[PDB]
């Protein structure tokens, strides 16, 4: 049976080689993308649109938010030194929360957010918080309380930061699939991974591009530059192109309009910076906001232009987390990446 | 007070330092000074295993020294027949980002896992003959970097969440958790009796664990950067680590410190994988420079080079009978060396 089982071995092999050949065609025809974002980057909202047109954890965040305030206010009278409120006009705010708590399937009305937010600036309500050591309170309580103004919004999608505080994520990696002009894309974004990336990021050395989403107008912007500087110069990622989404242009526009100079104090060279003359502002926007957004772009290109060498490229894009044009930018960038990869094999560039 | 506990940690750290210098009055390079060198070890590629579409991240030899499983990040476990180069099974994985694979000593299962944070057990000798997922072990909160079977029903995993876990495969439950590392855990190696294992982490330290008691016995420092690779000496009384500081080191469990450092001035890249030959006279180490160096583990001289890969050497394994070395690479090839 030495030759009998050698013909069964080599025939099971060629069957696998046929399946491996169909595998190869599917693997080659798909573009793989890594989505890396800042904590408040707004990455997830961009995924939310790339998906609808697994971030469904919006309600769970609200659960812990509602469950947090209820314990704090219900413990006010329970404490042996009972805690008094700083403003008596917040009395009715406590009343409402004391009733609506411990009910199934709460809707979270804005009036609830009004009492919840208004109670948190109250010193007396906060006074019991430092005594939350003596009673039982959720770990991620003060984090979400400061963030209610973000959560009141209709379009709220939990950032990764938000998901780490709670124990919502069970999945190491999330995958999004989409198709632009009959070309398939596999977008990945890490879920339950620690903030140390230096080991698992080497897995993505052969992706078509890394989609790097920056929470523009935030330091958190110097932090994004250092992460991009680490990705750009990594030994294993210096043949990987980076698609750079400078995300919160709409919030960046508002702060420069108002006079919120967190940008200039964090970057003293913003004072002696002038908009490049070949800039293309969106007609109907402040000549100061086009300066602020082109300054952040010029920070990433300072890193990018050094040590590029034609191995990989940076594609900066001013974006907004609510845009259907974003998948097209990725598709166009990936076409340029693939064309340059092919042109470099023929030594045409 | 926290600051009082810190200053007690330093003096206990000085006491172990002093209790280790007490027994380190002779070096391994004095004991092994008259030992005649092994000679130029010249291995050649005997088999190149082609069929993976993307870089190979891990491999494991089966205990019969003929079948080996290899994981690539195109999403495939391939089980090869190294003698005839015929693929026995090709397993498509649910998550493509596999970072480790294990062959059961009984030969009936493989395991794999990666950035999905799950270790997946596959039944090879099933009812109707097609490989299917039998159990999925979830509970790690970081990527699964290494998995090693104890028997058909237990498996140890190391994870990016800085812990290792002992599993019961029949019920899918974590029988034990091994905490104590500060960086994430990159590799583990079982002792020949399987009652202990050692883990190497991204905090430049290695730890020895009692499998049945769940606690750390000894901690080994000396490396300067993240430890990528760990492997037990054939008798279970020593192990060798490979780190990003470009050196390999050898530690003895009973002297409770390191004995040997394997480094050269021209070697400035991290070690990805280590493995001993059957007798433990050679230490084989894969490198980021696309090469594998053979080290005379008793004299710390380089004895040879495995020089046939076009990309990073990612994994490395020696058969149980000691007949061949398998090297996996980011160029998507497996090479078998003699």
């Amino acid at each position: 049976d030495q030759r009998n089982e050698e013909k069964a071995q080599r025939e099971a092999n060629k069957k696998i080689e046929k399946q491996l050949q169909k595998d190869k065609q599917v693997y080659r025809a798909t573009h793989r993308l890594l989505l890396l974002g800042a904590g408040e980057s707004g990455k997830n909202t961009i995924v939310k649109q790339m998906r609808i047109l697994k971030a469904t954890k919006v309600q769970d965040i609200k659960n812990n938010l509602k469950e947090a305030i209820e314990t704090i206010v219900a413990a006010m009278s329970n404490l042996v030194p009972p805690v008094e409120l700083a403003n008596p006009e917040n009395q009715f705010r406590v009343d409402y929360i004391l009733s609506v708590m411990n009910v199934p399937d709460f809707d979270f009305p804005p009036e609830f957010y009004e009492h919840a937010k208004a109670l948190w600036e109250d010193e007396g309500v906060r006074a019991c918080y430092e005594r939350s050591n003596e009673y039982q309170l959720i770990d991620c309580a003060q984090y979400f309380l400061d963030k209610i103004d973000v959560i009141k919004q209709a379009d709220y999608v939990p950032s990764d930061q938000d998901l780490l505080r709670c124990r919502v994520l069970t999945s190491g990696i999330f995958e999004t699939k989409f198709q632009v002009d009959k070309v398939n894309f596999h977008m990945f974004d890490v879920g339950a991974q620690r903030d140390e990336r230096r080991k698992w990021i080497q897995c993505f050395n052969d992706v078509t591009a890394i989609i790097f989403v920056v929470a523009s107008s935030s330091n958190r912007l110097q932090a994004a530059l250092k992460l991009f500087d680490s990705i750009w110069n990594n030994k294993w990622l210096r043949d990987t192109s980076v698609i750079l989404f400078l995300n919160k242009q709409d919030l960046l526009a508002e702060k420069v309009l108002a006079g919120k100079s967190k940008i200039e104090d964090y970057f003293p060279e913003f004072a002696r910076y002038t908009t490049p003359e070949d800039a293309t502002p969106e007609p109907g926007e402040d000549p100061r906001v086009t300066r602020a957004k082109y300054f952040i772009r010029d920070e990433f290109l300072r890193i990018s232009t050094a040590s590029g060498d034609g191995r990989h490229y940076c594609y900066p894009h001013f974006t907004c987390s609510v845009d259907t044009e974003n998948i097209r930018r990725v598709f166009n960038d990936c076409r340029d990446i693939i064309q340059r990869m092919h042109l470099r094999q023929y030594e045409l560039l | 007070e926290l600051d009082q506990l810190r200053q007690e940690a330093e003096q206990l750290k000085n006491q172990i330092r002093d209790a280790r210098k007490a027994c380190a009055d002779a070096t391994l390079s004095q004991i092994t000074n008259n030992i005649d060198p092994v000679g130029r070890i010249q291995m050649r590629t005997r088999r190149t295993l082609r069929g993976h579409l993307a870089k190979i991240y891990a491999m494991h030899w089966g205990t019969d020294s003929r079948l080996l499983v290899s994981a690539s990040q195109d999403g495939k476990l391939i089980i090869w027949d190294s003698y005839t180069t015929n693929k026995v099974h090709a397993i498509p994985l649910r998550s493509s980002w596999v970072m480790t694979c294990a062959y059961a000593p009984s030969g009936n299962y493989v395991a794999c896992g990666g950035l999905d944070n799950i270790c997946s057990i596959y039944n090879l000798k099933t009812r109707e003959g097609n490989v299917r997922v039998s159990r999925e072990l979830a509970g790690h909160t970081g990527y699964l970097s290494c998995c090693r079977f104890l028997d058909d029903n237990q498996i140890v995993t190391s994870s990016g969440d800085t812990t290792c876990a002992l599993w019961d495969i029949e019920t899918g439950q974590q029988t034990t958790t091994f905490t104590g590392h500060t960086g994430d855990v990159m590799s583990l190696s079982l002792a020949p009796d399987t009652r202990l294992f050692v883990s190497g982490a991204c905090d430049a330290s290695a730890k020895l664990w009692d499998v049945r008691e769940g606690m750390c016995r000894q901690t080994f420092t000396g490396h300067e950067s993240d430890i990528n690779a760990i492997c037990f000496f054939p008798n279970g009384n020593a192990f060798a680590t490979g780190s990003d500081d470009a050196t390999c080191r050898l530690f003895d469990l009973r002297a409770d410190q390191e004995l040997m450092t394997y480094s050269h001035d021209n070697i400035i890249c991290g070690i990805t994988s280590v493995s001993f030959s059957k007798s433990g006279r050679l230490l084989l180490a894969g490198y980021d420079d696309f090469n594998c160096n053979v080290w005379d583990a008793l004299k710390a001289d380089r004895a040879g080079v495995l020089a046939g890969h076009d990309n990073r050497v990612s994994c490395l394994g020696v058969t149980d009978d000691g007949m061949a070395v398998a090297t996996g690479s980011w160029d998507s090839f497996l090479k078998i060396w003699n």
């Epitope: 620690r194 903030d195 140390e196 990336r197 230096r198 932090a223 110069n233 040590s307 | 991204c202 500081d245």
Partner: nanobody
Framework: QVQLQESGGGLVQPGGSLRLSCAAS????????MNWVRQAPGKGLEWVSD????????SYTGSVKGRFTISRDNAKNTLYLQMNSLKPEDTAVYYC?????????????????????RGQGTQVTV
């Protein structure tokens, strides 16, 4: 055993001066890129300054440029941070952080919460 021990620090007046020191041991100091990283009360860790292996290439977070000076002594295995004209927004625990791997341009994770190759910190209070 990689060990980083920050020295200097302590209470100082606004506009004052301090010189933090980092006595490193257990690794080839000249092979690694070194960083200063600080954690203000309430906020997370953030990068202040880095210096390359030789000491020629230097960078700073923008809020300290012109006021801080980083330097290393490769013979004495020491990192320095000269802090001139301190402002109360400089009150932080200051950590000396090593880049995880030698001979690299990239420096991952030094601002991470549980980064191994970081000291315990000196409290600077302005």
């Amino acid at each position: 055993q990689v060990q980083l021990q920050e020295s200097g620090g302590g209470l100082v007046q606004p506009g004052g001066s301090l010189r933090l020191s980092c006595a490193a041991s257990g690794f080839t100091f000249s092979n690694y890129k070194m960083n200063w990283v600080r954690q203000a009360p309430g906020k997370g860790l953030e990068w202040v300054s880095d210096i390359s292996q030789s000491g020629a290439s230097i960078s700073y977070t923008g809020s300290v440029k012109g006021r801080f000076t980083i330097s290393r002594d490769n013979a004495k295995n020491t990192l320095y941070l000269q802090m001139n004209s301190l402002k109360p927004e400089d009150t932080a625990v200051y950590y000396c952080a090593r880049c995880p791997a030698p001979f690299t341009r990239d420096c991952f994770d030094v601002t991470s919460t549980t980064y191994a190759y970081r000291g315990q910190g000196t409290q600077v209070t302005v």
